[PDB]
Ligand binder design. Structure first.
Ligand SMILES: Nc1cccc2c1C(=O)N([C@H]1CCC(=O)NC1=O)C2=O
Ligand SMILES: [Zn+2]
Lengths: 370, 1091
């Protein structure tokens, strides 16, 4: 069993404690048009509810956020379809929740912690002289649908509220979808579209990853739940955008279950056929899931996936604890054996009593579920 | 695209029912909710009295009667699914009945999550308020003009059921609620003067884990009776009484009713149709009924069973059990088509005459329903007598009340038949001539008989049969036309008319006149409270083509209508429908004119023309179920009846009828003697209504249906529930269609507690008997069914798409496609193709088989070796539930409205994704309308229509039609129940048993009718004062948008029903080109002909 504090990574201690905290929430009306600033050096896709850590030192970015704090506190994170020609049709708004200004080495620096809020549709990207861009965006509403049975049942059967619990789920299907007999589809078909059902199917995989998981940590709402799960699936950029386009929590959960079932091996994106890890080695060392976004000392965001065993990896250099994202663990650079692609890091415990004693931090940009 | 939607059949299913004194404080009333309809009745004690039927601009959710303090009768509260609230009072003044709004308003909240246990509408016993549970965490209060409302923060979020407690100083509500700890019953006191909740009279007592309903019991008892799965418990603070009867374990109690007003007896009803009596605690099983949605105790012993899954009922609760042991006996059955889970249009009987066979009901109430336009006849005798020119019934015995003689007329001859019970025999009535053609004969004044022939008027006595009087034209001329009642005779001799009176042993010539032109037809039917003496004579003339109302005896012209044309009036008739007097006049071209007639003045008003046939129509009056009707004999035989003081015309299912008369004999009671070109048939008429419904009970669930013409039979997918027996398998619950098959069979495996058993039934298109039943594999769930010809093969195969369903599995991993051949009264399995998923849908795609396997879409080729071969595949990422086609254009559908259009490239041998659309909403049905359009059913009882230079434009579909139907469509079907203004015809079947029709309109015809709708809505008074625009607004929990590209045919059709000055108001400045009211009558009439 694991004795590491799963909460520790989510707090981004490497970013330093003693940060100005903001509480007040900003939310734009659905389908409403907005003009939001874009941080020039962010290239990661942000899913709503996901924590984005930043370490900004470019004067134009520092001044951008410093001004952003004085107002809205929200910026636009673009989901690039082609990162090279910097093409993006969708994105997510990020609201700063923790902020800190420092001055060191002749520069003004700022460290932020933002959170995904609202998905948007890019309407036009206008660029400012300072380098930072603005984005005319259209807020995409989250589409909440009622029970599959809500419409069909306007009757007496309405007041039938929702090991060994295996039979409860059977009694649940038989009961909740009894009115399917009035329709042209079976109760087992309606299950494939039931938020509670789809969620318990996902919760099944989440418990295979976090062996020490308590259901209270997980969101109850399928809207927050579909998004939390979306952000910890080590998938390619093309598939991630497809997931970000999804308007329904049901369509999202259904998508995630398909990805989860068809996922087997995780290879090196560069040589494509070199297997690095498998679905069975993934485990949640953080509360926000097996995979999460972290910042290196130069502001580059690495979405890293925690696995117990990795295969064709070569380490270089000796372990370091500098800027470690998992406190109590030292990291050593890991590359693909075949091509030399930087795959992430090997994390090793600094104390003999720690569990896990070793794990692997693999960046998703280096992986391919092929 | 612009469409027109109309109701072919109103919803049949019962949503709720109540008893009270709504009409008068004397009459016991039964109010039945059939969704958008409200049927109001009086308990006849010897039946059910139909008073009024009112339609509404909403789906009824809540329906509860109430009398607040001093009132002459009862006030009715109704709340719609769209949160329209109204208090309705009854108002009657003579033959004029009107429902009156007393208060109205929309109770919907700006925010809030609509509760899981649905809308709950309770009322305080003292009529102090209305309690509404529409949203979780709130309790809305309407203190019973604009229905002013307010909320109360209700702490316990998950409320199961709630009722207002009886006998309380301060109004109290008792509710079953669930929390993570468990399910507990609680009390709260609702304050109006403080607009808040305060601690209830008693403690939060813990109830059953599956406690479902609260039953508020009146004084002297008080408190509440909580009902669960295994237990029935009672709570009154420090008073408790917990019982767990085993008899209620099998099924959950879904509905109740109060029997004794004090609260000593309650009716209880489960999901299996078992009826229980909760006595004050003891429970006793009474018997079996239809699966009751709602129950109502009325009068003494009689119970109303309001069923949504099957035919509704009237049953008797006897004090003594019968031989079987049932204290329940069925009196009357009420046809319910709901739910329509699948259907098809088949030309059974006559080609061109479409019939609709549906998969109706569920479980033990499962049935087939055959819906055919027009009334039918039940033949009891058939006689070879060609060339009948007339039919008349006689009572040759004055001492007898029944017709024992039938008189037939032929070219220049008269034959007489005697009815010795069921035996028809050739005879000669003494006094009557057989060598002359008869124009009339019947029983007349002073125990006499009359015979009007081409030569004379003969008066015959009954004791004995002999000629007592005879009348002839003075120059021995021939009688041309003749009319006769009981005291009077009016005969034409070319242009001349003669008025005679029937006296004892005398035919007295009262008066005579000469007409302007030749006489064509005559009628002297006495109307109103005229004791067999008519002061009026209706006459049709040649050349001028006029219908004239003449006075008797003077022969004075009262009115003269110029019918217009070159076609002479052939038949004329004066009649009374629903106490309103009318004049009917039929022309030689099959056209029928019908006016209202003033008995005092003689004025013909409200001229209406209807096209009945191609041949001259003959009008004969007959009685059916103590109601006067008119049979219109032509090549399209029709019954002319009255419904809401408007004349209705329903067709008869007979090739042609030339002449008819009503025969009421000892052997043939309350019968109809009908004659065509070759034969005379004596029979009984069906129910006088537009559509006819034949019921084929299956006693199991019909799921799917299709038709094989080459086999003269239907393919029906059905399922029956069986229980796990103390053996290596299962046993049935009752005999059903799949068990009682003529010849039986089971599937042979080649692939690797209550059970659902699936079957393929084979039913003969005439008898409707289960010729064969093929039982599917254990755990095999049959999904899709198609009867087609594939490849080069000339044999029609019944194809079934299955899914192997296991509890552990969520999405079927296995499935089959099974090809069957129906030969020698037994299904022969041709091909068995195992697939890696569920076969949700299958369609015959240009000699190939298109079938969905979960997410994938497969095209199969049928080889000479007689087995399907995989051609091309399309992997969709969206479940292929819906699969519709037209040419090389394919529609793929998801339950969440994710539509995508595919195209098969023949030379490439692959699928091309034309367009896609993903806008999540629940979708129940979809059908392709044409090459560029498709129709569908969307969440919150709506209908939609999607349509088809740049790629990012052509690859996207646009939503052109949006309409709130108020019904849940399960099936769309191309066809018509009828034998140009509109394009196409798609029928639709709903959960409530409602059938509808969707047709296309032109751009300007749509605008004409849309403009007309806005004008009609300014005239028409809405029940509960709901705006029609609001009712038809495409509605979801999210958005409410006005209806687009759709015309409410039901609203358009009520133009023919509004007052004539109101029609003038609607058409005034309507239109650019001007529109006459006469132009708009024709257009609206033309639209009523589509259904
Ligand atoms: N000090 C440097 C310097 C350059 C790049 C990196 C670091 C560094 O510490 N990490 C990761 C290693 C793994 C970790 O836990 N935190 C990091 O910031 C880098 O990518
Ligand atoms: Zn590599």
């Amino acid at each position: 069993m694991i004795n590491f504090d799963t909460s520790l990574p989510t707090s981004h201690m490497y970013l330093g404690s003693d940060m100005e905290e903001f509480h007040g929430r900003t939310l734009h009306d659905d389908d409403s048009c907005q003009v939001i600033p874009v941080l020039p050096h962010v290239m990661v896709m942000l899913i709503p509810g996901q924590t984005l850590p930043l370490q900004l030192f470019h004067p134009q970015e520092v001044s951008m956020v410093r001004n952003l704090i004085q107002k809205d506190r929200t910026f636009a994170v673009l989901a690039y379809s082609n990162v090279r020609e910097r093409e993006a049709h969708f994105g997510t708004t990020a609201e700063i929740y923790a902020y800190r200004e420092e001055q060191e080495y002749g520069i003004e620096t700022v460290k932020v912690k933002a959170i995904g809020r609202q998905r948007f549709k890019v309407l036009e990207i206008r660029t400012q002289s300072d380098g930072i861009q603005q984005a005319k965006v259209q807020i995409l509403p989250e589409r909440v649908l009622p029970s599959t049975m809500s419409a069909v049942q306007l009757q007496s059967l309405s007041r039938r509220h929702i090991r060994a619990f295996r039979q409860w789920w059977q009694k649940y299907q038989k009961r909740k979808f009894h009115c399917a007999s009035l329709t042209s589809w079976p109760p087992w078909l309606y299950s494939l579209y039931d938020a509670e059902t789809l969620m318990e199917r996902v919760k099944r995989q989440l418990h295979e990853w976090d062996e020490n998981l308590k259901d209270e940590s997980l969101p109850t709402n399928p809207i927050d739940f579909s998004y939390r799960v979306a952000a910890c699936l080590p998938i390619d950029d093309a598939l991630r955008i497809q997931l970000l386009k999804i308007g329904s929590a049901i369509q999202r959960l259904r998508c995630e279950l398909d990805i989860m079932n068809k996922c087997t091996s995780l290879c090196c994106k560069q040589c494509q056929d070199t297997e690095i890890t498998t679905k069975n080695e993934i485990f949640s060392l953080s509360l926000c899931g097996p995979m999460a976004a972290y910042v290196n000392p130069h502001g580059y965001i690495h979405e890293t996936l925690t696995v117990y065993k990795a295969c064709n990896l070569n380490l270089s250099g000796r372990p370091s604890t500098e800027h470690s994202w998992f406190p109590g663990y030292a990291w050593t650079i890991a590359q693909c054996r075949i091509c030399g692609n930087h795959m992430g890091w090997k994390f090793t415990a600094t104390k003999k009593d720690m569990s896990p004693q070793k794990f692997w931090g693999l960046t998703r940009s280096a992986l391919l579920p092929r | 695209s612009y469409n027109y939607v109309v109701t072919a059949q109103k919803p049949t299913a019962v949503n709720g029912c109540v008893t009270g004194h709504f009409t008068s404080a004397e009459d016991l009333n039964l109010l039945i909710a059939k969704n958008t309809r409200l049927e109001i009745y009086v308990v006849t004690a010897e039946g059910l009295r139909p008073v009024k039927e009112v339609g509404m601009y909403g789906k009824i959710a809540v329906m509860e009667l109430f009398r607040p303090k001093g009132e002459s009768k009862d006030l009715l509260f109704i709340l719609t699914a769209k949160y329209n609230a109204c208090i309705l009072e009854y108002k009657q003044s003579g033959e004029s009945i009107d429902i009156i709004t007393r208060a109205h308003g929309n109770v919907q909240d700006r925010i809030g999550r609509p509760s899981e246990t649905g809308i709950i509408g309770i009322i305080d016993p003292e009529c102090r308020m209305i309690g509404l549970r529409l949203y979780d965490g709130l309790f809305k209060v309407i203190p019973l003009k604009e229905l002013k409302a307010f909320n109360i923060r209700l702490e316990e979020l998950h409320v199961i059921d709630v009722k207002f407690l009886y006998g309380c100083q301060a109004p109290t509500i008792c509710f079953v609620y669930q929390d993570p700890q468990g399910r507990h019953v609680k009390t709260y006191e609702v304050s109006l003067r403080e607009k808040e909740f305060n601690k209830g009279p008693w403690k939060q007592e813990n109830v059953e884990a599956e406690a479902s309903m609260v039953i508020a019991v009146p004084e002297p008892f008080g408190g509440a009776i909580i009902i669960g799965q295994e237990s029935i418990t009672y709570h009154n603070g420090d008073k408790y009484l917990a019982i767990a009867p085993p008899i209620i374990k099998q099924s959950t109690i879904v509905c109740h009713n109060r029997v004794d007003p004090n609260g000593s007896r309650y009716l209880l009803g489960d999901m299996e149709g078992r009826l229980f009596m909760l006595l004050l605690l003891r429970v006793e099983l009474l018997g079996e009924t239809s699966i009751a949605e709602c129950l109502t105790y009325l009068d003494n012993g009689v119970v109303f069973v309001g069923s949504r899954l099957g035919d509704s009922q009237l049953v008797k609760l006897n004090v003594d059990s019968n031989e079987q042991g049932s204290y329940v006996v069925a009196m009357e059955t009420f046809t319910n088509l709901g739910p329509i889970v699948d259907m098809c249009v088949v030309d059974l009987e006559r080609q061109g005459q479409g019939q609709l066979v549906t998969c109706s009901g569920a479980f033990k109430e499962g049935s087939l329903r055959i819906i055919r336009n027009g009334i039918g006849i039940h033949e009891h005798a058939s006689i070879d007598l060609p060339g009948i020119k007339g039919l008349w019934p006689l009572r040759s015995d004055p001492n007898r009340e029944t017709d024992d003689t039938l008189v037939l007329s032929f070219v220049g001859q008269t034959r007489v038949l005697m009815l010795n019970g069921e035996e028809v025999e050739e005879t000669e009535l003494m006094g009557f001539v057989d060598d002359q053609q008869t124009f009339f004969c019947g029983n007349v004044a002073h125990q006499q008989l009359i015979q009007i022939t081409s030569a004379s008027v003969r008066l015959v006595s009954q004791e004995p049969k002999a000629l007592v009087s005879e009348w002839k034209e003075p120059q021995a001329k021939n009688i041309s036309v003749a009319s006769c009642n009981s005291s009077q005779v009016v005969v034409a001799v070319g242009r001349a008319l003669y008025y005679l009176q029937i006296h004892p042993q005398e035919l007295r010539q009262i008066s005579h006149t000469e007409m302007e032109h030749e006489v064509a037809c005559l009628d002297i039917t006495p109307l109103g409270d005229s004791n067999g003496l008519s002061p009026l004579c209706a006459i049709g003339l040649w050349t001028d083509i006029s219908a004239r109302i003449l006075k008797l005896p003077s022969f004075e012209l009262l009115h003269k209508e110029m019918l217009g044309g070159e076609i002479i009036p052939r038949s004329i008739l004066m009649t009374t429908f629903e106490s309103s007097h009318y004049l009917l006049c039929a022309l030689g071209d099959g056209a029928l004119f019908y006016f209202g007639l003033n008995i005092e003045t003689g004025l013909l008003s409200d001229r209406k023309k209807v096209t009945l046939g191609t041949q001259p129509t003959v009008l004969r009056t007959f009685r059916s179920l103590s109601t006067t009707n008119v049979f219109a004999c032509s090549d399209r035989p029709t019954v002319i009846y009255s419904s809401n003081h408007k004349l209705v015309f329903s067709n008869v299912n007979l090739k042609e009828v030339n002449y008819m008369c009503p025969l009421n004999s000892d052997g043939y009671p309350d019968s109809l003697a009908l004659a065509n070109n070759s034969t005379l048939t004596i029979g009984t008429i069906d129910e006088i209504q537009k559509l006819h419904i034949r019921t084929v009970p299956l006693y199991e669930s019909p799921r799917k249906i299709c038709y094989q013409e080459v086999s003269q039979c239907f393919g029906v997918l059905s399922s029956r529930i069986e229980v796990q027996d103390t053996s290596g398998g299962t046993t049935a619950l009752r005999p059903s269609a799949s068990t009682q098959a003529l010849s039986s069979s089971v599937s042979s495996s080649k692939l690797f507690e209550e059970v659902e058993v699936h079957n393929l039934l084979i039913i003969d298109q005439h008898t409707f008997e289960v010729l064969h039943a093929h039982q599917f594999l254990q755990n095999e769930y049959a999904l899709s069914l198609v009867s087609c010809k594939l490849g080069k093969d000339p044999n029609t195969y019944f194809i079934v798409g299955t899914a192997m369903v296991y509890p552990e599995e969520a999405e079927p991993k296995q499935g089959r496609i099974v090809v069957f051949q129906y030969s020698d009264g037994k299904l022969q399995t041709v091909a068995e193709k195992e697939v890696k998923g569920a076969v949700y849908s299958m369609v015959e795609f240009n000699g190939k088989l298109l079938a969905s396997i979960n997410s994938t879409v497969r095209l199969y080729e049928w080889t000479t070796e007689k087995e399907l071969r995989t051609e091309c595949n399309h992997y969709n990422n969206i479940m292929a539930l819906y699969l519709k086609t037209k040419g090389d254009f394919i529609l793929v559908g998801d339950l969440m409205r994710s539509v995508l259009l595919l195209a098969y490239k023949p030379m490439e041998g692959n699928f091309e994704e034309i367009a896609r659309d993903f806008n999540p909403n629940w979708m129940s049905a979809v059908e392709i309308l044409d090459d560029d359009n498709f129709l569908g059913a969307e969440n919150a009882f709506n209908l939609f229509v999607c349509q088809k230079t740049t790629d990012e434009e052509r690859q996207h579909l646009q939503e052109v039609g949006l309409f709130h139907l108020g019904e849940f469509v399960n099936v769309f079907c191309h066809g018509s129940l009828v034998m140009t203004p509109t394009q196409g015809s798609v029928l639709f079947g709903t959960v409530n048993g409602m059938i509808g029709l969707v047709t296309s309109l032109s751009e300007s015809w749509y605008n004409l009718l849309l403009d007309m709708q806005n004008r009609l809505n300014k005239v028409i008074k809405s029940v509960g004062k709901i705006e029609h625009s609001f009712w038809r607004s495409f509605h979801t929990e999210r958005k409410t948008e006005p209806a687009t590209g759709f015309i409410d045919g039901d609203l358009i059709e009520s133009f023919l029903d509004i007052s004539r000055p109101k029609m003038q108001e609607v058409v005034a400045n309507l239109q650019k080109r001007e529109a006459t009211a006469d132009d708009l009558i024709k257009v609206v009439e033309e639209l009523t002909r589509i259904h």
